[PDB]
Structure 1
C-alpha cells in the first residue's frame, strides 16, 4: 500500500504530522492511563494537487488507523435531508473502528460559509457537521483531518477550538522535493541513463506533485509516440520486452517541460535559499553583523537570555542597486537553514494601487507558519518612489502598505522566529517610522563590491559557463574600478552571448562547407569554440558600463554619515 516512501517532496510537514499522530494512534492505550487531550482535528491546507489526501492515506496506513474518506461533493451531491444521514453514518462507522482517521477531502464544499453563508440546506450541513465535530466525546481515537485550499475559505467556526485546532500548510514542493517527487513518479518506466532528473527538477520550478506526475506521463507519451509507432507492431497487449527497449530521453523530458503549464506558478514560494556566502565575495563586516543579528539568538539563545537582552528582529539594507542585498539576505537565510520569503516591490505596489493592504496580514501569517523564516521586503521604498520622492504627495511619508507592515511588525515578535529584512536603494525617502525601535532599526550599508569582492562576483557569475584558464579574472576585477554586481553580471552575460554567437555562426558555416563540398571522409574537428576565451571577454568589456554613478554613492555616503555616532564621546573613559 501507500506509505512514507510514496509521500514525496520531503517538505518536512509530513514529519510534523507524524509527530502529531503517532502517539494518538501508534500508542492509543497510553492516552487511556494519562490525562491529556490529543489532536481532535488537523487541517491540511495548500495548493491543490499537493498530495494532502495521499499524505492522510499514508499516515493512516503507516499507523494502522482505519482510514475513512468523506468526499466533499460526494455528500454535497446527495439529496438534501439525506446527506446529513451520510455524514452521521460516516462518523459512526469511523467511531466503530477505533482508532480511525476520517479524512474530509475538499472541506471548502461542505462548509464553505465564510459568514456570507448563502442558501438554506448548506447552513444545515455546516451546523450539523459542527455538532458532530464538537460532539466527539473524547472517547475512542478518531482523528478528523480535512483538506482545504486556504484556511480562510472554510467556515470560521470549523477553525475554532476543538473542531480544527491545528493547521499544516503542505505548500508547493521545493527543488529537493520536486526531485524526490520526480523520483517517486519515475520508478517503473525504466528511465534512461542520460536523463538524470536533476536538471529537470531545477527547471521544474512552479510545478506541484500532480504537475510533476503529469509532466512525467507526458514525457512517457512522447517517448511512446516517437518510437514503437513507426514499427506499428501492435497487439492486444504490447510485449513487455518491446516496451522496455525504449528509454525516456532527455529531449522528451525537455519537451514535456516546455508543455507543462504549472498549476500555480503565482503562488508564493516558501523555500530555503540555495545561495551561499561563496556567491558574495566579501562584506565580512556586514557578513559578521548579519550572522550576529540572525544566527546568534538561535544558536545561543541561553546567552541572550542570561544578559536579559532581546535581539533585534529587523534589519534594513541600504545601498546602490545591484550590490547584492537580495543575495546577502538569501545567504543569511541559508546559513541559518531557515525558510526565506521575498516580497518584491511589484507586490507592494500592487497592494498599494489596489488599496488592498490586508494581504500584508496574510503574508505575515504565512511567514509565521513557516518558522524559522527570513521575511525579506525587497525594495521597500517602491511606494515612496511611486508617490514621488522630490516633492511627492502633499501628505507625509506614511502610506497604507507601510502602515500595515508596521502594524504587523508591532504585533509580531511574538513568534520569536520571523526575521524582517528590508532592502532600499533610496534610504532618504523611506518612512522614518520604519527605523524606530521594534522595527527595522539595524541599518546596514552595502557598499560597491571591492576588488576582491568583484573577483568573487565574477567567479560566481562564470562558474557555470566554460571559461578558459587563459582569461585572468583577477585582472578583470581590478580593471573594473567601480562596477556594481549588476554591471559585472552584464559583462559576463555579454561575453557569453558573444561566444555563443561566434560558435553558432562558425558551426553553421562549417556545415555549409560540407554541404557545398561533400568531403570523402567524415572527420568532425569538434567545436571551434569550446570555451570562453580572452578575445570574447575583451570584446564584452569593450561595452562594459558603470550603472551606478558616483553622485548617488555620494548621497549614500551622506546618509551613512547621517547616522553619525556623535563627535565627543570617542574618548569616553570611566573615572578610575
Structure 2
C-alpha cells in the first residue's frame, strides 16, 4: 500500500488492539506457535462491532499492522461483477494470496455478500458463498493467509459461514474510550488548523471531547469535518468579499476553539440506537433537604465507585447494590441522579417500563445489551427506577415468558455485577412487596434506603431550591408556608409553586412575583399527600 497505515492511525483502540495482536496477528505472523502447540488458528476471522467504527479502516490497519499483502476485495464490488466474472474474482485473489503469504485476505461487509440466513437463494449468492466456503476448505493450515472481515452483527450471514472451522474466532470492537478518542481526533488535527502546537489546546480538546461520551471513529471524523465547515462560516463574511481568492488566507484560517464547541452543538453525537443519558447536572445542593441521606448515600455509592481495592486489602466484600424504598417519587429519581452528578461516573437511567416495553423482538436480548452498554459506558451507575415493574413477584400471572426471558436474564445480569466492573445498581421502588424477592436476596440487593417524607425543616429547603426559578414577592414568608403544612411530598410542592403562578396569573393580568396569598390559595388547592397510613406501611416494612 502507498500510504501505509501504522497502528497510530486507528490508535486509541490499543486495549482492543492488544486482543487483536495476540489473537489474529500472532498466527498470521508465524502460525508455528499455535500449529505446533494448541489449537490451530482460525483462518476466517470477523471483526464484529456496533455498525461502523470506520469499519474498513479498522481492519485496513490490521492488514498493514501485520504488514501482510493487503489483498482487498469488498462486498459491494464482490457482487457487482457480472455473472461468472464474480466467480473468477474470488479464486484469483485467493490464488494471489497463496503465492504471496503472509497475505491478508480482506473482505469486508461479508453480510453484504451473504446476507439472509437461508432466505438467500441467489445464483451468485450460492456460487460465491460456495466458492469462498470451499476456498476456505481447500487450505493448508500453514499457508499463511487469513481472511479478515467485518460485519455489523453476528447474525447477518448464513449459518454455514459461521460453521466452526469456517470463520469462528471473534473479536468485538465497540465505541472508543474517552482518551482513545483523543488520539483519533489528534490524528485528524494534523490536517486541521488550530494555529499552533498548543498542548493546552490538545488538553482542552481532550476534555472537550470528553464533554460527549462518544462518537465512533467515523463520527469523530465528522465532528472535525463540521469544525472546518462551521469555521468556514466564520470566515464566510470576510472571504466572500474577495471574489478572486486570496493566498493571504493561508494562515487566516485558524479555527477558533469555540467553533469546535459550537459544532459540538448539533452533530447528533454517536448514532446509538438506545438513549444514553450521561451524567445529569443536578447537584447535591439541588436535592430537597436530606443532608443525612447525602452523607450516607455518599459513603454507600462512593465506596463501590471510588475504592473497591482497599476493601479487599482489609478483606471485606462490598455490597452489590441498593434499592430505595419509601413514599413514591419523593424526588427519588432526583436523589439517585444527584449522587451520580457529583460522582464523575456516567448515569444511566433506562426506565423500568421502557425496558419492559422494549425487547429486541419480545426477547430479553435488549436488557442483556443494556447491561453490556452499561459495562461499556462504565464508570457508571445504572439506575432502574421502578425495578419492581421490571421484576415483580414471579408469582404474577400477567407474566408468562416475562419471568423466564427477562426477569431471569435480569437476575443473571444483576449477578453480572463484578468488582472489576464499574457498574453500580441503584434500584428504586415504591412498593418492595410487589417486587420479586429474588432480587432482594443475597448476591443482589442488600439494603433498602428508606426516605422519610419531607420534614418541616426540609420543606423550606425544597422550597428555596424550587422557587429559584420563580420570582418571590417581599410579601412572601417562606418559612411560614412550610410551617403551614408538612402535608405535602416534593412532587406536589413542585406543582405548588407552579399552581401559585396559575392562580397568580389570573390575579395579576400580567404576572407579578408570587405572594403569600398566592401560596395560601394553592396550598388549599393541592390535597395533602403524605398518608400516615403509608408511612406506617414502610415503617413496618422497615423490618425487611
Q: TM-score, normalised by structure 1?
A: 0.64
2:226 paired with 1:218: yes
Distance 1:140 1:174 in 2: 36
Distance 2:140 2:375 in 1: 32
2:250 paired with 1:247: no
Partner residue of 1:347?
A: 354
- Aligned partners of 1:108 and 1:153 also within 8 Å: yes
1:87-107, Cα deviation, whole Å (9 max, x unpaired): 233233333333333332212
Matched residue SS, 1:114:
coil
1:215-268, Cα deviation, whole Å (9 max, x unpaired): 322332343351553342546xx73x5222222224544554455345624346
Distance 1:83 1:172 in 2: 34
- Aligned partners of 1:207 and 1:265 also within 8 Å: no
Q: RMSD over aligned Cα, in angstroms?
A: 5.6
Q: Which of 79, 84, 95 is the equivalent residue of 2:82?
A: 79
Q: Which of 59, 62, 65 is the equivalent residue of 2:65?
A: 62
- Aligned partners of 1:317 and 1:421 also within 8 Å: no
Flag the 1:377–1:446 CA change in 2: closer, same or farther, 3 A. Answer: same
Distance 1:485 1:24 in 2: 63
Distance 1:228 1:117 in 2: 57
Flag the 1:40–1:315 CA change in 2: closer, same or farther, 3 A. Answer: farther
Q: TM-score, normalised by structure 2?
A: 0.67
Flag the 1:177–1:327 CA change in 2: closer, same or farther, 3 A. Answer: farther
- Aligned partners of 2:305 and 2:424 also within 8 Å: no
Distance 2:218 2:490 in 1: 38
2:380 paired with 1:404: no
- Aligned partners of 1:380 and 1:422 also within 8 Å: no
Distance 1:278 1:27 in 2: 57
1:511-533, Cα deviation, whole Å (9 max, x unpaired): xxxxxxxxxxxxxxxxxxxxxxx
Q: Which of 435, 439, 446 is the equivalent residue of 1:435?
A: 439
Distance 2:8 2:82 in 1: 39
Partner residue of 1:44?
A: 47
By how many angstroms is 1:445 displaced? 1.2
Equivalent residues in 2 for 1:237-386 (5 A)?
Answer: 239=247, 242-250=249-257, 252-253=259-260, 256-258=263-265, 260-262=267-269, 264-267=271-274, 269=276, 283-288=294-299, 315-319=322-326, 320-321=328-329, 322-323=331-332, 324=334, 326-327=336-337, 330=340, 342-345=349-352, 347-351=354-358, 355=362, 357-363=364-370, 376-382=383-389
Flag the 1:366–1:190 CA change in 2: closer, same or farther, 3 A. Answer: closer
By how many angstroms is 1:71 displaced? 0.7
Matched residue SS, 1:6:
helix
Distance 1:422 1:121 in 2: 53
2:209 paired with 1:201: yes
- Aligned partners of 2:11 and 2:183 also within 8 Å: yes
Partner residue of 1:423?
A: 427
Greater CA drift, 109-118 or 394-403: 394-403
Matched residue SS, 1:94:
helix
Partner residue of 2:448?
A: 444
How many residues are paired up?
Answer: 491
Q: Which of 93, 97, 100 is the equivalent residue of 1:97?
A: 100
Greater CA drift, 442-451 or 366-375: 366-375
Equivalent residues in 2 for 1:3-18 (5 A)?
Answer: 3-7=6-10, 10=13, 12-18=15-21
Equivalent residues in 2 for 1:98-137 (5 A)?
Answer: 98-133=101-136, 135-137=138-140
Partner residue of 1:229?
A: 239
- Aligned partners of 1:341 and 1:375 also within 8 Å: yes
1:257-289, Cα deviation, whole Å (9 max, x unpaired): 455345624346598x79999899755545555
- Aligned partners of 1:313 and 1:440 also within 8 Å: yes
1:84-139, Cα deviation, whole Å (9 max, x unpaired): 33223323333333333333221211121234334343133334333334554431
Partner residue of 2:538?
A: 559
Matched residue SS, 2:355:
helix
Distance 1:24 1:275 in 2: 49
Q: Which of 144, 147, 170 is the equivalent residue of 1:167?
A: 170
Distance 1:312 1:134 in 2: 51
Flag the 1:242–1:82 CA change in 2: closer, same or farther, 3 A. Answer: same
1:23-61, Cα deviation, whole Å (9 max, x unpaired): 335665655654453454443233444223222222333
- Aligned partners of 1:342 and 1:376 also within 8 Å: yes
Distance 1:63 1:203 in 2: 35
By how many angstroms is 1:18 displaced? 3.4
By how many angstroms is 1:148 displaced? 1.4
Matched residue SS, 1:152:
coil
Matched residue SS, 1:80:
coil
- Aligned partners of 1:11 and 1:170 also within 8 Å: no
By how many angstroms is 1:74 displaced? 1.1
Matched residue SS, 2:427:
strand
By how many angstroms is 1:400 displaced? 5.2
Greater CA drift, 204-213 or 281-290: 281-290
